[PDB]
Ligand binder design. Structure first.
Ligand SMILES: Nc1nc2c(ncn2[C@@H]2O[C@H](COP(=O)(O)OP(=O)(O)OP(=O)(O)O)[C@@H](O)[C@H]2O)c(=O)[nH]1
Ligand SMILES: [Mg+2]
Ligand SMILES: [Mg+2]
Ligand SMILES: [Mg+2]
Ligand SMILES: [Mg+2]
Ligand SMILES: [Mg+2]
Ligand SMILES: [Mg+2]
Ligand SMILES: [Mg+2]
Ligand SMILES: [Mg+2]
Ligand SMILES: [Mg+2]
Ligand SMILES: [Mg+2]
Ligand SMILES: [Mg+2]
Ligand SMILES: [Mg+2]
Ligand SMILES: [Mg+2]
Ligand SMILES: [Mg+2]
Ligand SMILES: [Mg+2]
Ligand SMILES: [Mg+2]
Ligand SMILES: [Mg+2]
Ligand SMILES: [Mg+2]
Ligand SMILES: [Mg+2]
Ligand SMILES: [Mg+2]
Lengths: 403, 49, 41, 81, 104
RNA sequence: AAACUCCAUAUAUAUAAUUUUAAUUAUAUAUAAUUUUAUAUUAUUUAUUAAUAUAAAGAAAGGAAUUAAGACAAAUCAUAAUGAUCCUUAUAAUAUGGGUAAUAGACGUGCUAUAAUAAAAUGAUAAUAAAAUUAUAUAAAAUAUAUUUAAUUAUAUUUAAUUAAUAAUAUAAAACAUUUUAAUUUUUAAUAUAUUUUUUUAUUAUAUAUUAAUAUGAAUUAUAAUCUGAAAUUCGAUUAUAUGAAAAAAGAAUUGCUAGUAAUACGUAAAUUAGUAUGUUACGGUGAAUAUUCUAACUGUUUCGCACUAAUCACUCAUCACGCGUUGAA
RNA sequence: UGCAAUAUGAUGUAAUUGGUUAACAUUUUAGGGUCAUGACCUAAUUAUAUACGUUCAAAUCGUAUUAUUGCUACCA
């Protein structure tokens, strides 16, 4: 009957490679540690993250599927000098810190986001990451309408996100912040459920560390998150870095699959988790701390419309385009906050050389390119097959494409 | 032998089977053996044409 | 073991029948019997 | 189904004698619609070789005169075995 | 080939114990086509009913009346849709246009 | 029979004042191949020889048109034309309708299914074609409604440009990312986990309860409604809500294909139309594996027999049934 | 006033130390067919007869229905 014995691969190829521990057999290798203050020391080297960075970048969701993260013991990055250094340097020194990462599919838009998150944990910042925004726009989660907060709330995703924040961010950095207002929530904790129906918070005596810990009801979880974000906005002690990946989904999907009570489709801005995420990029949510920083990243698994080109000024404005392919409200929200782009440059021959060197050291290549090939010929051929420096195509050439 | 596995994806099933054969747990070695034994039995009928 | 048509017709003939549907016999005191006799006359 | 905006299919056929007198309307116009005015009138619709008599009912309205005059009659296999 | 339900042994109803049959009936009100109402005894648990077609709106029972509208069941079948489907033509113009055919 | 020929191949030359741009093109003429050599090995009519080996040089490898004489009294007097006949107030002419369309069991050739090496939804700086059509046309954009932001599909409203290497039919589609996807407790929730977070590990629910009956299939029906036409009743194609049957990969047997072929849930155009292709005729995209030992089956010749010769569908042996003749016996 | 054996068919038919189907054949389904006769497939019928006992096994022992054997009575 139940033919699926425990420990048997039953999902698709991608899911199996992503979940099943295919890295249990990987070869350990001593590599440098990713640190920005030592970037001059590891400018062009395939460096591995630290244990702090690895514990983070996991709750945040910085490492995704279909990245070949399982060919090695743990995810690794090349640092580079025209993408990582050129990005983090302006992130440190730019008067207004809000950027969007662009480029061709497979360039490394995510990996650069993960590097930014690693820099944040190194630099003692509170990180909020939304990663795949399709989860709260597809319709596979619960929702309700909040009368006071005149918006739609999604308690399941809200619970997951608050748990992400709490489990990733440093307890010391979170406890360092003291509450500014007093919040009264309902109680959903099985312990002390009957004795008290509402939990209470107090000014300058409780903290955000237990603000996140409080467990409330689905209908009040929206106000819970409002409190989280407003307190983090008014704090000015430690920086807050807010990040959304696959921002193409949101700027191309204005209307969610979530359907109103009259056949209407609820607007993303009318739905919370879109209003919160868009007001911060636009500038309605002001962070007191000087170096809060905001980062966005588009994905190649998403259709393209004129919205982002018009927002970034790459093409003029055509007012006759249909809403399915141009959204003036999204453009206006993006332009009110002075977001500037950042196109990730593709690899060079030298970057391909170092990557292939590391791959050989880790034994992820073949006899084809280890026995009968000369290094110059191999690097030239792979640079040519990778579309002149596309990391995903380079990996696919080296490992996946076997003939 | 790979189609007798569970995974809904042929790539996964085939990879599992190839891994099994690489570690020498194939279920067709006995088929090779039966064919080879039959050839050993019929050696006599061989007639160089 | 009966058919649904059999059950339907048994219900119909239940509506026919007097079983488990009639009330107790009407027993009247002597005075009320005389009253009724006068009414009818 | 004929488009409604075009209007019902109407052909010149005699109705004045049909109402004033009891004269039935014999016709070959099988494609004409049965308007509400024909109820109670006797029609003789051509079926191919003979005229079938039919009286118009309030429910026939909207149908075609030729729906009640079968042109071919039923098949019967003579097995003889 | 016949189907019958079996006979059970009949309960004996003795001489003098045999009561009459008084089935349960209701004093139901029955409204005719006009405003008239008749009280009657019915076994259905419906104390009130109205009729759309009945004696009070039948030509055979109502010869003297000049005008008498007829009606049938509503919200059933495709009735009256042969009129609802054609709005351009509406009620005397058609009567005038049906003057004659001029055929011989 | 081969060559000659047409579509394809390469080169050149000539035309286009490169805004009919496709110069990566169009089509006029010519050249080239039915490929050359060089050593090797078996051999062998001796070198003058082939079958291979394959250093070399070449762009060089296909397709279709053409199917003789005789035949099968093969099909065609319904493409038209014809000899004999046979209808001449019909067997010759017109219109209204109804036939060709009916349905018990048969039988061909096709279309659509029966799920995870596979079917749906999305992919706007619009991934990538070829060959045709448009004066008895064509339908761009745009605007309205089905349906709510759009979009996408169906209808209407206007009709732009072009009788066309210029407008239009027409943003090919499959591939390829992504999401999903019942049988499947292989799943989804609730809380907890933590360095798998689009994720896994716990304890509970998801259990009328593991070997076929969906979130596959789209036949059959109900009802709006819309095209074309004077007019879909018998009988035409369309979207909409509902309906949701058989099918759980198929028995003797059997069909087509040897390379740009088969296959393709790959699409595209034209002819026949006022209108309606699961058919026909053409165009390109992606692209295989299989073969040098079988009895059989057809043929081209051959060798053996022949009493057939309008030739094996040949010819040819009787007594029994029909009529007439002659001779026996008795 | 007691007792015996029968039937999966359109033409009857399995058998002996315990779970599961009980030939043919029949028929439009028909084999291999040079349109073609004339040898499976494909196309019909068992459900251990309505009761009783057991290990996760009762054709097996009783009664009873479809009803044709052979003794005694045969000086009623
Ligand atoms: N070592 C190393 N690998 C990298 C780097 N950038 C990209 N890669 C590799 O290339 C892959 C590219 O995937 P992503 O990093 O998600 O690239 P992307 O451009 O965000 O891709 P899309 O979102 O699908 O458009 C990564 O998964 C890595 O395997 C880098 O800086 N260092
Ligand atoms: Mg990314
Ligand atoms: Mg020739
Ligand atoms: Mg010939
Ligand atoms: Mg003939
Ligand atoms: Mg003729
Ligand atoms: Mg026909
Ligand atoms: Mg044919
Ligand atoms: Mg499918
Ligand atoms: Mg389909
Ligand atoms: Mg395209
Ligand atoms: Mg073209
Ligand atoms: Mg248009
Ligand atoms: Mg598709
Ligand atoms: Mg379906
Ligand atoms: Mg259909
Ligand atoms: Mg159909
Ligand atoms: Mg056509
Ligand atoms: Mg020859
Ligand atoms: Mg010959
Ligand atoms: Mg005696």
């Amino acid at each position: 009957a139940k033919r699926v014995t425990p420990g048997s691969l039953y999902k698709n190829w991608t899911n199996t490679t992503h979940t099943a521990q295919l890295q249990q057999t990987a070869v350990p290798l001593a590599l440098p540690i990713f640190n920005f203050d030592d970037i001059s020391k590891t400018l062009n080297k395939v460096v591995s993250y630290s244990n702090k960075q690895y514990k983070s970048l996991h709750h945040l969701g910085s490492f995704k599927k279909s990245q070949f993260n399982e060919l090695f013991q743990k995810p690794v990055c090349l640092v580079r000098e025209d993408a990582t250094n050129s990005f983090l340097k302006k992130l440190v020194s730019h008067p207004v810190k809000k950027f969007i990462i662009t480029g061709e599919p497979g360039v490394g838009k995510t990996v650069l986001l993960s590097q930014a998150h690693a820099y944040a944990v190194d630099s003692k910042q509170i990180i909020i990451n939304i990663s795949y925004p399709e989860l709260f726009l597809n319709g596979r989660n619960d929702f309700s309408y909040d009368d006071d907060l005149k918006l739609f709330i999604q308690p399941m995703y809200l619970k997951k996100l608050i748990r992400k924040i709490l489990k990733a961010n440093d307890p010391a950095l979170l406890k360092s912040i003291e509450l500014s207002k007093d919040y009264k929530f309902s109680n959903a904790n099985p312990k002390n459920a009957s004795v008290k129906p509402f939990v209470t918070l107090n000014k300058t005596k409780n903290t955000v560390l237990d603000l996140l810990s409080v467990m409330t009801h689905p209908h009040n979880r929206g106000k819970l998150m409002k409190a989280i974000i407003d307190e983090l906005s008014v704090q000015s002690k430690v920086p807050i870095m807010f990040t959304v990946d696959n921002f193409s989904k949101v700027l191309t999907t204005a209307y969610s699959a979530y359907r109103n009570t009259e056949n209407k489709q609820i607007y993303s801005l009318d739905l919370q988790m879109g209003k919160l995420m868009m007001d911060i990029i636009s500038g309605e949510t002001k962070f007191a701390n000087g170096e809060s920083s905001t980062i966005l990243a588009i994905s190649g698994v998403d259709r393209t419309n004129k919205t982002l080109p018009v927002a970034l000024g790459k093409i003029p404005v055509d007012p006759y385009v249909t809403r399915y392919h141009y959204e003036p409200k999204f453009v206006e929200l993006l332009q009110k906050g002075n977001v500037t782009e950042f196109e990730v440059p593709k690899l060079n021959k030298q970057e391909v050389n170092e990557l292939i060197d590391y791959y050989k050291q880790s034994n992820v290549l073949l006899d084809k390119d280890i026995t009968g090939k000369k290094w110059e010929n191999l690097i030239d051929e792979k640079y040519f097959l990778s579309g002149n420096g596309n990391p995903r195509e380079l990996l696919k050439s080296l490992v996946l494409s076997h003939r | 032998s790979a189609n007798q596995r569970v995974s809904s994806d042929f790539a996964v099933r085939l990879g599992e089977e190839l891994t099994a054969i690489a570690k020498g747990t194939s279920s067709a070695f006995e088929k090779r053996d039966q064919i080879h034994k039959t050839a050993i039995a019929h050696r006599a009928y061989i007639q160089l044409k | 073991s009966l058919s649904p048509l059999a059950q339907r017709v048994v219900t119909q003939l239940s509506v026919m029948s007097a079983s488990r549907k009639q009330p107790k016999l009407l027993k009247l005191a002597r005075e009320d019997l005389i009253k009724h006799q006068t009414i009818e006359k | 189904s004929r488009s409604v905006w075009k209007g019902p299919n109407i052909v010149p056929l005699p109705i004045r004698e049909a109402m004033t007198k009891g004269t039935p309307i014999r016709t070959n116009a099988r494609a004409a619609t049965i308007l509400p005015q024909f109820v109670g009138l006797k029609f003789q619709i051509h079926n191919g070789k003979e005229y079938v008599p039919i009286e118009i009912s309030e429910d026939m309205v909207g149908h075609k005169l030729g729906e009640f005059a079968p042109t071919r009659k039923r098949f019967s296999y003579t097995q003889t075995k | 080939t016949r189907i019958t339900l079996p006979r059970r042994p009949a309960k004996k109803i003795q001489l003098g114990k045999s009561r009459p049959a008084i089935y349960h009936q209701f004093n139901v009100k029955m409204e005719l086509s006009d405003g008239s109402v008749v009280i009657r005894r019915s076994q259905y648990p419906k104390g009130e009913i109205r009729l759309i077609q009945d004696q009070r709106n039948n030509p055979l029972w109502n010869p003297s009346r000049d005008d008498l509208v007829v009606v049938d069941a509503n919200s059933g079948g495709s009735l009256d849709r042969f009129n609802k489907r054609y709005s351009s033509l509406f009620s005397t113009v058609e009567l005038s246009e049906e003057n004659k055919k001029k055929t011989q």
